[PDB]
Amino acid sequence: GFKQDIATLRGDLRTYAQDIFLAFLNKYPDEKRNFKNYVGKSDQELKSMAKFGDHTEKVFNLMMEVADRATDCVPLASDASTLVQMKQHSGLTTGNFEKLFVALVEYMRASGQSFDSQSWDRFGKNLVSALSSAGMK
């Protein structure tokens, strides 16, 4: 289920984080707009950059914290607020997040492993909803 998936991802968080973010970037090329430093680089090139691995993991670490504090895949309002208020999220809208989780759910489904995809799909939708309630456009 969801709780076990959190453990699966945390277990090899660096690898999963990179794979899923890369799936995101490749599914939605315009999204690289929020990432000028990743432009014009293959997946393997990106993985060779120190900040790519470091940032992607720190992103997914916070995502797993938010996921774990959730109740029935509903994130805490305060976690949503944190994500809205982060300086690094200045220019973002809920659409950026919607797309991230569409990619994440697609990755899970295509994976050999028994991820609870429906739960992550709900988590993504409920996070988007919470981001909106916490004031993200």
Known binding positions? 36-37, 51, 55, 58, 88-89, 97
Q: Which residues are known binding-site members for heme b? A: 36-37, 51, 55, 58, 88-89, 97
Min separation Cβ 51 and ligand NPO, Å: 7
Which one of residues 18, 46, 96, 104 is an interface residue with ligand HEM (CB under 6 A)?
96
CA distances (Å), origin 100, targets 21, 31: 8, 10
Question: How many contiguous H segments (helices) and E segments (strands) does the chain have?
Answer: 7, 0
Q: Collapsing DSSP states into helix, strand and coil, what is residue 71?
A: strand
Choose the one of ligand HEM, ligand NPO, none that binds residue 56, judging by a C-beta under 5 to 8 angstroms depending on kind.
ligand NPO
**Residue 46 is a binding residue for ligand HEM (CB under 6 A):** no
Choose the one of ligand HEM, ligand NPO, none that binds residue 62, judging by a C-beta under 5 to 8 angstroms depending on kind.
ligand HEM
Name, in order, each residue with C-beta under 8 angstroms of 89's C-beta and a sequence gap of 6 or more.
83, 136
Q: Which DSSP state fits 86?
A: -
Q: Which pair of structure tokens corresponds to residue 91?
A: 């220019």
Binding positions for ligand NPO, rule: CB under 6 A? 21, 24, 55-56, 59, 100
